[PDB]
Design a protein around this ligand. Structure first.
Ligand SMILES: [Mg+2]
Ligand SMILES: [Mg+2]
Length: 540
DNA sequence: GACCACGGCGCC
DNA sequence: AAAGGCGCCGTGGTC
């Protein structure tokens, strides 16, 4: 096949590499190679050879860049065929799949991976010709974002380990109180972590009424939704609900996170997966830092563990109602656009009609209720499902659905146009032309078809919000470098940065402006910003 | 030790 | 606490 030539490769070569494990912050670089111009070059010693590359160009380029950064080398990621394939079709999420589909095989040898990266890029680049909008997304968003993501991953975030270890002991004792009480109420001990055993106790032994069934295997459900509805049926239910919350938080965050501190950085390093979702969102794994608790009292105590470096502060920026602002722009609805242009709070307007009075002081709970209905109607829930899900008579539900769409006729028209076009072309698109293929828009099984319609009109909204955030990160990153600040985390419509204390206020101002002005829409974008020593404080 | 499907549930 | 989009936990089961 390719001609074998000595290391190092010429500039522009495609790289292949093998890691001992998937997480580049934790991986041993086992082998490194490069392919170009009909030649393949294999590195005698991979870590040393890393020093010869100017760019990581090839499949999974960002992963190699993260390892390089870990080793003190400023090796940026460049072209990556994964990103081309993901823009053609976001179900293209793995190198194994992308290779099979576009002209090779993903193996475990660096030379082969290098040669593969080269051929896949050639082929996929050809596919993106004529695709002007996908090309722009590649050049202006995805390719530059991979470098930003590489820096975020390699930087990591600081965690108060001692605090979490002390917290574990406290939660353990509370969990023991709950499980002892549950077993007494049951009349015998069992495995409270087993939903199958819990099912027998609740519905067979205590004879509580089963309310719902599980999706795939049709067992009587013990989900929080069922338990909430049985809260007053028996005192064991509230205890179980509390046990669920504590064990969830303890097993997922409190116990695992302290063990994941990197020995060299003394920080926690997530992976930001760039080709993992059907809508263009990022995902986070190993550990997932996009789902750190924030709602409950114990969740808030966990979030306080994420702290700024000594002498630095966290800066937290959140887009306000990005998805509804995107929907206003996509649909062109005059009335919805007027809402945002006039700084009015849409969920409060709906809370004036329902729960009113008063317009001035609707109160939190009623607004949360109005929000729930606004989005419910939006996702095409029936007057029946809304009336029963939201403890209100059937008539009220219908009235609100008609009002909602009489106020925003173009939102309805936009949803209808998007579904028809998805059916015809087989895909739907974000504002920037990112695509998702949704085949089941024609299924003859109504539950299947209707689930598809929800996916289909969700994608342009969630996906455009993702495009905007990604473009914002791409724009914001060089500015932070210049100011000596760091970008740490993204959580879909939020960013968390770290800045020296003397510069935190300027960083927050600047970041807020870059985010709000990322790509002007028919409505303003609003960003709320907070500064603090820890992630919870930085929003309070 | 690993994988899996599942139910369940943390976040946006 | 908006929940379509995710990733992780333990169970029960397999290999
Ligand atoms: Mg928010
Ligand atoms: Mg699942």
């Amino acid at each position: 096949a390719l001609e074998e030539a000595p290391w190092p490769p010429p500039e522009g070569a495609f790289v292949g590499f093998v890691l001992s494990r998937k997480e580049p912050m934790w991986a041993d670089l086992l082998a490194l190679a490069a392919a170009r111009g009909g030649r393949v070059h294999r590195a005698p010693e991979p870590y040393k050879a890393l020093r010869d590359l100017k760019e990581a160009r090839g499949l999974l380029a960002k992963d190699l860049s993260v390892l390089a950064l870990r080793e003190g080398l400023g090796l940026p990621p460049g072209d990556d065929p994964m990103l081309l394939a993901y823009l053609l079709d976001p179900s293209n999420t793995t190198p194994e799949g992308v290779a099979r589909r576009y002209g090779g095989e993903w193996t475990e040898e660096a030379g082969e991976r290098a040669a593969l990266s080269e051929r896949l890029f050639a082929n996929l680049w050809g596919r993106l010709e004529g695709e002007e909008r996908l090309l722009w997304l590649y050049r202006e968003v995805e390719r530059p974002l991979s470098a930003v993501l590489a820096h975020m991953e390699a930087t990591g975030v600081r965690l108060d380990v001692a605090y979490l270890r002390a917290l574990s002991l406290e939660v353990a004792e509370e969990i023991a109180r709950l499980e002892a009480e549950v077993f007494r109420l049951a009349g015998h001990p069992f495995n409270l972590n087993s939903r199958d055993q819990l099912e027998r106790v609740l519905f067979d032994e205590l004879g509580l009424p089963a309310i719902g069934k599980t999706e795939k295997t049709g067992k009587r459900s013990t989900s929080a939704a069922v338990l909430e509805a049985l809260r007053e049926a028996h005192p064991i239910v509230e205890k179980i609900l509390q046990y669920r919350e504590l064990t969830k938080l303890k097993s997922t965050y409190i116990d695992p996170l302290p063990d994941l501190i990197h020995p060299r950085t003394g920080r926690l390093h997530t992976r930001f997966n760039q080709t993992a979702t059907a809508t263009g969102r990022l995902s986070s794994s190993d550990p997932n830092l996009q789902n750190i608790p924030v709602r409950t009292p114990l969740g808030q105590r966990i979030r306080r563990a994420f702290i700024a470096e000594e002498g630095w502060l966290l800066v937290a920026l959140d887009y306000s109602q990005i998805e509804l602002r995107v929907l206003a722009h996509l649909s062109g609805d005059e009335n919805l656009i007027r809402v945002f242009q006039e700084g009015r709070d849409i969920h409060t307007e709906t809370a004036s009609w329902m729960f009113g009075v008063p317009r001035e002081a609707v109160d939190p709970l009623m607004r949360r209720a109005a929000k729930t209905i606004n989005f419910g109607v939006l996702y095409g829930m029936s007057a029946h499902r809304l009336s029963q899900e939201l403890a209100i008579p059937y008539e009220e539900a219908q009235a609100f659905i008609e009002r909602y769409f009489q106020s925003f006729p173009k939102v309805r028209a936009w949803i209808e146009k998007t579904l028809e076009e998805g059916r015809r072309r087989g895909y739907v698109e974000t504002l920037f032309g990112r695509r998702r293929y949704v085949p089941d828009l024609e299924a003859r099984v109504k539950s299947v078809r209707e689930a598809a319609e929800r996916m289909a009109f969700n994608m342009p909204v969630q996906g455009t919000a993702a495009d905007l955030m990604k473009l914002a990160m791409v724009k914001l990153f060089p500015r932070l470098e210049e100011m000596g600040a760091r970008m740490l985390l993204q959580v879909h419509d939020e960013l968390v940065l770290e800045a020296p204390k003397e510069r935190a206020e300027a960083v927050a101002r600047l970041a807020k402006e870059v985010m709000e002005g990322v790509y002007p829409l028919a409505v303003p974008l609003e960003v709320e910003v907070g500064i603090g020593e820890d992630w919870l404080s930085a929003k309070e």
